[PDB]
């Protein structure tokens, strides 16, 4: 095509106007976005005491999937089907219910009475003091527990938006073996595997540029 | 009376482009097209395209501003919003 020619643009300094580029790194974000990002960065940068840093160790993907598979079979009664049962109770005048136990006070009381077969504790609870004592309480009472990612996931378990805790107290005879196997799996995967590393402090992580400076200084010290 | 500004009266107020109509209705383009089909709103040709579109000769779809203002009161628009909330 003789009518089309190649006319390259010089994007150097003092040359043609710079093209549009991705300036996402330099965006002046809204104050709330900046606050949440810098808050997470500060949580990473500061040294974290062990009783808070223990919540960064959670179940693996497969074990969490199996746990939620077991709990979804005991998801509690909704508002619509409670109406159905009460209509049946009105005419008859119901079997024993099996349901996931939830509510912070209720589950803490069940742990103190040694009735919870398994306790799930959400990791992203704010304020964290609401569950910061729960692993130690479960250990002292001998209650099997697991820290899981997602209070929203626990909320979907108990028909809520969020849920700081979930508890399996009584299970059916067609799921008792699954519950026992899950307890042993959690003991091997979360209790014994993370028993020592939860006694350490966390969050001694440098920023990107500070880490690069430290590495360059160490290299210049070791060789010239 | 002070001097009046140009591009405000006549063709410039009589006709509204499709982008401006969609923005005023605060709906999507597909919902706007379906509303116009249901209500029988049809594109129009001004006798002076430059006067209607600020001197630009670029091809644009034009509507009647009063037709779009009448389309603002159609309850099917509220039904569309209800369906979106349900979805």
């Amino acid at each position: 095509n003789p009518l089309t020619h190649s006319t390259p643009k010089n994007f150097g300094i003092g040359q043609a106007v710079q093209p549009k580029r991705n300036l996402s790194r330099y965006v002046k974000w809204p104050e709330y976005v900046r606050v949440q990002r810098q808050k997470k960065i500060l949580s990473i940068r500061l040294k974290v005491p062990p009783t808070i840093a223990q919540f960064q160790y959670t179940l693996d993907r497969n074990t969490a999937a199996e746990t939620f598979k077991l709990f979804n079979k005991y998801r509690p009664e909704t508002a619509a089907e409670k109406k159905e049962r009460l209509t049946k109770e009105a005419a008859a005048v119901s079997p024993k219910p099996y349901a996931v136990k939830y509510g912070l006070n209720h589950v803490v009381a069940l742990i103190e009475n040694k009735k919870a077969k398994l306790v799930l504790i959400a990791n992203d609870v704010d304020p964290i003091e609401l569950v910061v004592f729960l692993p130690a309480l479960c250990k002292k009472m001998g209650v099997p527990y697991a820290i899981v990612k997602g209070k929203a996931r626990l909320g979907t378990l108990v028909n809520q938006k969020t849920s700081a805790v979930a508890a399996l107290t009584e299970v059916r005879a067609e799921d008792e073996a699954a519950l026992a196997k899950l307890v042993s799996t959690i003991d091997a995967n979360f209790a014994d595997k993370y028993d020592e590393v939860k006694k350490h402090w966390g969050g001694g992580i440098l920023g990107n540029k500070a880490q690069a400076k430290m590495d360059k200084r160490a290299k210049n010290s070791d060789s010239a | 009376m002070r001097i009046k500004k140009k591009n405000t009266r006549g063709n410039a107020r009589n006709f509204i482009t499709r982008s401006q109509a969609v923005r005023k209705l605060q709906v999507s383009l597909a919902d706007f097209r379906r509303l116009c089909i249901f209500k029988g709103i049809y594109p129009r040709e001004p006798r002076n395209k430059k006067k209607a579109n600020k001197g630009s000769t670029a091809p644009t779809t034009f509507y009647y501003a009063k037709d779009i203002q009448y389309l603002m009161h159609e309850p099917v628009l509220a039904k569309f919003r209800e369906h979106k909330t349900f979805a």
Binding site: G12, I13, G14, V17, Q18 | -
Partner: protein
């Protein structure tokens, strides 16, 4: 006691600067990528008088590196700079009168003007007419530059700090006698209300500490 003028001047009031006829604040360009890494060429469009300032000013037009338009800067004119001259600003600019360069990019004995105290503050030192700064030396390890100021002081500045090659034009202004209270009047009319001055001795004991006798 009664408040003296030395204390009355702090409130502002009738003591503010007379800024109606000023051309604008005389500053260097904002230190950007072009001046940090390469250079940028601007053109001297005119050389103008600034009311209340001895030194003349130069209007220098650059091209915006990120948008199609022109950018206007107000420099203090160094002696020998003329209209239509090409000014070069950046780390890679040549050693010529009127060019803006970092203090680390110039050799020892270089005469500069409109020198930054900190890099990017757009000119702080040697701005009055006939004044200049001498590059005494360099400390590359700390990236510092030793300079001599018009008052004879020796200062240590960051080498990233910039300056204009040459000496501020309009020198020799103070060599001419005013001869006249009227010429002093017209001088301070464009600056501020600090003229005429009444001696504190001529004042009353309430008026001034030097008053009375």
């Amino acid at each position: 006691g009664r408040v003296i003028r030395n204390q009355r001047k702090g409130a502002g009031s009738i003591f503010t600067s007379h800024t109606r006829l000023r051309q604008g604040a005389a500053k260097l360009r904002t230190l950007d990528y072009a001046e940090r890494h390469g250079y940028i060429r601007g053109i001297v469009k005119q050389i103008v008088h600034d009311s209340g300032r001895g030194a003349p000013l130069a209007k220098v037009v650059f091209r915006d590196p990120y948008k199609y338009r022109l950018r206007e800067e107000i420099f203090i004119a160094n002696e020998g700079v003329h209209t239509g001259q090409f000014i070069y600003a950046g780390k890679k600019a040549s050693l010529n009168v009127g060019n803006v360069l970092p203090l680390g990019s110039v050799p020892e004995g270089t005469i500069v003007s409109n020198v930054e105290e900190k890099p990017g503050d757009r000119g702080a030192l040697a701005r009055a007419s006939g004044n200049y700064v001498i590059i005494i030396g360099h400390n590359p390890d700390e990236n510092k530059t030793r300079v001599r100021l018009p008052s004879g002081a020796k200062k240590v500045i960051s080498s990233d700090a910039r300056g204009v090659i040459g000496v501020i034009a309009g020198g020799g202004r103070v060599d001419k006698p005013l001869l006249k209270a009227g010429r002093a009047f017209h001088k301070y009319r464009l600056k501020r209300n600090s003229w005429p001055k009444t001696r504190g001795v001529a004042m009353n004991p309430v008026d001034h500490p030097h008053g009375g006798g």
